[PDB]
Design a protein around this ligand. Sequence first.
Ligand SMILES: CN[C@@H]1[C@@H](O)[C@@H](O[C@@H]2[C@@H](O)[C@H](O[C@H]3O[C@H](CN)CC[C@H]3N)[C@@H](N)C[C@H]2N)OC[C@]1(C)O
Ligand SMILES: [Mg+2]
Ligand SMILES: [Mg+2]
Ligand SMILES: [Mg+2]
Ligand SMILES: [Mg+2]
Ligand SMILES: [Mg+2]
Ligand SMILES: [Mg+2]
Ligand SMILES: [Mg+2]
Ligand SMILES: [Mg+2]
Ligand SMILES: [Mg+2]
Ligand SMILES: [Mg+2]
Ligand SMILES: [Mg+2]
Ligand SMILES: [Mg+2]
Ligand SMILES: [Mg+2]
Ligand SMILES: [Mg+2]
Ligand SMILES: [Mg+2]
Ligand SMILES: [Mg+2]
Ligand SMILES: [Mg+2]
Ligand SMILES: [Mg+2]
Ligand SMILES: [Mg+2]
Ligand SMILES: [Mg+2]
Ligand SMILES: [Mg+2]
Ligand SMILES: [Mg+2]
Ligand SMILES: [Mg+2]
Ligand SMILES: [Mg+2]
Ligand SMILES: [Mg+2]
Ligand SMILES: [Mg+2]
Ligand SMILES: [Mg+2]
Ligand SMILES: [Mg+2]
Ligand SMILES: [Mg+2]
Ligand SMILES: [Mg+2]
Ligand SMILES: [Mg+2]
Ligand SMILES: [Mg+2]
Ligand SMILES: [Zn+2]
Ligand SMILES: [Zn+2]
Lengths: 96, 129, 25, 206, 87, 120, 217, 97, 81
Amino acid sequence: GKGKPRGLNSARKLRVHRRNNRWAENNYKKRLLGTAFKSSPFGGSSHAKGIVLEKLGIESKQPNSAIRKCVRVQLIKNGKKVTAFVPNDGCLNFVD
Amino acid sequence: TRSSVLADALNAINNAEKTGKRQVLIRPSSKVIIKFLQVMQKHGYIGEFEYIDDHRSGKIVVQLNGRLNKCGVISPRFNVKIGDIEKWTANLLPARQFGYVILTTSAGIMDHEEARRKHVSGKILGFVY
Amino acid sequence: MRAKWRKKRTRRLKRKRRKVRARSK
Amino acid sequence: SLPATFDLTPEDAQLLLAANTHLGARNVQVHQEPYVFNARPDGVHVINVGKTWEKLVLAARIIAAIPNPEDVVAISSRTFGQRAVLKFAAHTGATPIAGRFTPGSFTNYITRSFKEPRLVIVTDPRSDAQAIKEASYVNIPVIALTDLDSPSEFVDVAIPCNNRGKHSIGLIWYLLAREVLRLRGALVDRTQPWSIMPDLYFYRDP
Amino acid sequence: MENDKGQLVELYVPRKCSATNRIIKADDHASVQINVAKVDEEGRAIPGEYVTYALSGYVRSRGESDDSLNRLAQNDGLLKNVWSYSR
Amino acid sequence: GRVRTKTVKRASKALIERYYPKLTLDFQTNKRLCDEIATIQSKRLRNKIAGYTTHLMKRIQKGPVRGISFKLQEEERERKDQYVPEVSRSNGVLNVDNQTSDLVKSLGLKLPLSVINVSA
Amino acid sequence: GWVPVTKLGRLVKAGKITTIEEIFLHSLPVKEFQIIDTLLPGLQDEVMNIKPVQKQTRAGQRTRFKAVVVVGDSNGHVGLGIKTAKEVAGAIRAGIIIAKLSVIPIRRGYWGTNLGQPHSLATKTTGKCGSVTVRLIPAPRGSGIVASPAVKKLLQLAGVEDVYTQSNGKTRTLENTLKAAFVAIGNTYGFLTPNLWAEQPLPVSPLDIYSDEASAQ
Amino acid sequence: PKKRASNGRNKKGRGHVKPVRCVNCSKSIPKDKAIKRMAIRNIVEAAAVRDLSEASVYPEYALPKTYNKLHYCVSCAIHARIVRVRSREDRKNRAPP
Amino acid sequence: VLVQDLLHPTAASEARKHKLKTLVQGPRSYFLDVKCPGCLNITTVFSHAQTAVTCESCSTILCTPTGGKAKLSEGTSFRRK
RNA sequence: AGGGGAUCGAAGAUGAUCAGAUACCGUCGUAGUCUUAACCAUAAACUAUGCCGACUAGGGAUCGGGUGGUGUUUUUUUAAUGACCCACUCGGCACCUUACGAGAAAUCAAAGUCUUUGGGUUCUGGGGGGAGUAUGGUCGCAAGGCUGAAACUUAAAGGAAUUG
Ligand SMILES: CN[C@@H]1[C@@H](O)[C@@H](O[C@@H]2[C@@H](O)[C@H](O[C@H]3O[C@H](CN)CC[C@H]3N)[C@@H](N)C[C@H]2N)OC[C@]1(C)O
Ligand SMILES: [Mg+2]
Ligand SMILES: [Mg+2]
Ligand SMILES: [Mg+2]
Ligand SMILES: [Mg+2]
Ligand SMILES: [Mg+2]
Ligand SMILES: [Mg+2]
Ligand SMILES: [Mg+2]
Ligand SMILES: [Mg+2]
Ligand SMILES: [Mg+2]
Ligand SMILES: [Mg+2]
Ligand SMILES: [Mg+2]
Ligand SMILES: [Mg+2]
Ligand SMILES: [Mg+2]
Ligand SMILES: [Mg+2]
Ligand SMILES: [Mg+2]
Ligand SMILES: [Mg+2]
Ligand SMILES: [Mg+2]
Ligand SMILES: [Mg+2]
Ligand SMILES: [Mg+2]
Ligand SMILES: [Mg+2]
Ligand SMILES: [Mg+2]
Ligand SMILES: [Mg+2]
Ligand SMILES: [Mg+2]
Ligand SMILES: [Mg+2]
Ligand SMILES: [Mg+2]
Ligand SMILES: [Mg+2]
Ligand SMILES: [Mg+2]
Ligand SMILES: [Mg+2]
Ligand SMILES: [Mg+2]
Ligand SMILES: [Mg+2]
Ligand SMILES: [Mg+2]
Ligand SMILES: [Mg+2]
Ligand SMILES: [Zn+2]
Ligand SMILES: [Zn+2]
């Protein structure tokens, strides 16, 4: 009979079972693990400033061939090296 | 084992009119089955039903015309207070005009329209249309 | 590779981890 | 409602029991037949013939309802029904189908066997179930010669004959063509046998 | 299918299966209408004067069309013997 | 491999259905007959058609052959039907089971009485 | 001219039967498009969707075209049929015709109150085709048709001005979407409501009363 | 998915059954799955009729017929014996022919 | 099927059904007053035996039990009630 | 850890085979295979399908029990048997036909009674991978069992059916 307990007094077993099961919901999990604040290069914030280490052209996956101008950046607030992409045409000549 | 007798009876009923049959044997009757069948009868979804006598809980033979689509039990007997009877109806009843949510109150087993006018509420029971 | 031999690979490798880690005790 | 006259006559009783129409099928019988009476020992069941005659009456009382008697349809694929339907057809209005049914007749207007009855008579609801299928798409009531084992699906006004063979097919066929004339047609008065022999409808090997 | 005051609206009040009292709708193509002719004294069948029934598609498919009409006609007077209401 | 195609047997089919009178079994009559009735653009085809519709005829006289009906046979069956000499009841009473008899007395009365037993 | 076959189809060329509603009443199997062409000429054709389908042929690659068409007017009748030709516009043509053979009565109704000229639906009806199930619920006046544009358009030619919708199954596959949407309203008359409890005499067949005006040569 | 409602062969309510080794390739196969044929033959054959009873004593002596039951592993079965491939439908037929 | 009388089913088709599954359950066993004229009078026995009975005076065998009704030993008469 | 140890036979030894052939096939043969005492707790441990309860449909077979029969065999002589037959009925291993219904489909008498959504209850799952990995706890003599994350990565993986 769809084994969820029907009882009028089964409230706990009902709300516990769903509490138990929201962990399968992914970014529910990521909410309560703090993963925003714990890992990931930004603090859990929109943007972050950093400093260019190197200018690295990345070759794109198939079925495309390009060299995608990128930058190794080290986050000021944070210290993590992180690798970011420069948009549009040239625009790598704006950094060094 | 057996948990809701009423549910068991409202079953073979729906299992009758889905097979076309005009007569269904139900066992082991009840006090509520009676009053529920009564409410069903009085609004015209069944014919006359006869509680027979064994010495245990009895049986019943229900005559059903075919005017019925679905009757059924609401399995946990839910507290509904007067302001949620509307809410409850709107879910399982085909359109505003007809059909009945039947429930149980301290004033006796009755539908929502009878409930409205007496203006008492209670725990939910079942539904008929 | 076959799930069973992949299973045996993972076991071979993980009995090697206790060894290398035992040496650390 | 019945007239006192049309209850089963011992002439018909002896006509019926001649062909062995009373004698039903073996260990296999579908539930849908109460028509059984007191199963015959060792592998037969005895049909109630007055209930068979009343059905025969109700068949005629229905066969002659349909305004134009010619687009009523009797059908037999069986060898044992093939002659019996022609004679039913020539006498009454009805147009027959004897032998292969050529499926696509009741639907598929572009077909050259296209028919459009208001009713259908069937000798063997098994072998002719093909038509019973077709009639179930087009809203066509259907009469069926039936034994005890026969597929009650999608047929009305069953008649409880013996479709196993010999004389029983055309017998119950002949009495039906007989009674449709005895209602709203030129023919015999009370107690009068029919000059047409019941053996007219029959099988020829030769 | 009435309205505010008076008038009957909503075209096509549909039939009903006489056997199961079920609405028989436009697309039910195993549904059937039986025309049984009412005869008169001396057996003549009176063309155009009918005892009619409607039979739903469901009843015919189940194999109940036979026993359904037998019940339906006999209590309407067109037969006796045959069908037993009790079994 | 001598086998007539469909354009030959369909012609031969539709010819005899409407033209069975005339159309004697003899080829050369039918062949010449074809030119005045059916239009065919080939010498050979006409002869191929003819020779087959010939065959249909030659067998038809021994009784029907499937696929073709000109309606003349249809009621030739109707009047060809007869020959019942002996229908049933004689010489004696109705031979019937124990139970079949038990049915009679239930719904009615008058029947001649003969009943024997059965088993196995 | 027309030149009908089909006893049902002949009887309407002569002026015997005035409207479709009696074809329904007797559950008559319309086998011809002209019947309902002439019975309700104010129909509109709407092509909905066209997608190509490709058979792998023992020699070849067959890419034909499948079209879906909803037809109807504003009142109680809608067709839905799906035709696939070897060319596009030809598939719409034979679709509108097959959609016409399909058309079906639609019982509108009053949401909560009697008042004027029904808008919403009789009851709650749920059609199911493939994975897609489509639920129609009564709505008040001015709620309008609440549904995707593709089911909305079929509920316009259906003549409903007010209905709520819930959609289940994979609704991006249109054939089963509408096919279930069409079955929902196509079920509206299968619901035996108490105002329809009233006893009715069972009228007799226009194929009978006009029997001689029908039939053959 | 399921190619049979008999699964391999013929155990419902049993849950284990002793196996048997194949006569040909000696593969272990369960006895209910064993796909067996009964091999009965005269110790003689077609060509042996005449040279037998005439080179004997006795008024014909009649004749013994060999008996052993054969079991096959379904891999070597299909390689040779009564086996092979049936349409999805015909696979349902259980009759010998 | 599809219509039948549940209230008034045939006693002939009833008596084929199981003792529990009839319209009202009741036992189908009986009681017989059994006689060994070696005794002037009767001891009244239940039909399905279990205990294999003796007559009040002498040690003697009326029945021996089986799963169902008992084997009534050799000559005896019986009255059902 | 004792006994046992015929046969078959992971390791290993080999003869052939292949371009190679640590294999397939042939041959020897250790542990094993059996058993007593203690451990281990896993298998596609499968019906890949929770348990209790109600209901929803025909058909012939079959297992065990029970009821009926001026039924057949045995005979020694009715009997009592004992098997057989026929019918009914419970409880079982299954099977056929169906499809009112269900479903993505293959198919399902349940996988049916579901948007007309509620009989009671247990368990699990929430894209693929990373991974049944790391770690901690715990069980084991050991192999291992149990519980069991994340970082990162990725647009599909996937089911049934269709045509080639
Ligand atoms: C065979 N395993 C099944 C699994 O397939 C599934 O089964 C459901 C079943 O529980 C639902 O059924 C359930 O809900 C019904 C409500 N209408 C009534 C009660 C119950 N049988 C079915 N409607 C659909 C199946 N696939 O969920 C339950 C289960 C036991 O795990
Ligand atoms: Mg917890
Ligand atoms: Mg957790
Ligand atoms: Mg998990
Ligand atoms: Mg911050
Ligand atoms: Mg670098
Ligand atoms: Mg809701
Ligand atoms: Mg290893
Ligand atoms: Mg060290
Ligand atoms: Mg488009
Ligand atoms: Mg809106
Ligand atoms: Mg496979
Ligand atoms: Mg297997
Ligand atoms: Mg196992
Ligand atoms: Mg040892
Ligand atoms: Mg050894
Ligand atoms: Mg080696
Ligand atoms: Mg190789
Ligand atoms: Mg090789
Ligand atoms: Mg060896
Ligand atoms: Mg298994
Ligand atoms: Mg099971
Ligand atoms: Mg498992
Ligand atoms: Mg199962
Ligand atoms: Mg798991
Ligand atoms: Mg992920
Ligand atoms: Mg695990
Ligand atoms: Mg995993
Ligand atoms: Mg594991
Ligand atoms: Mg661990
Ligand atoms: Mg311990
Ligand atoms: Mg430890
Ligand atoms: Mg991409
Ligand atoms: Zn093998
Ligand atoms: Zn004594």
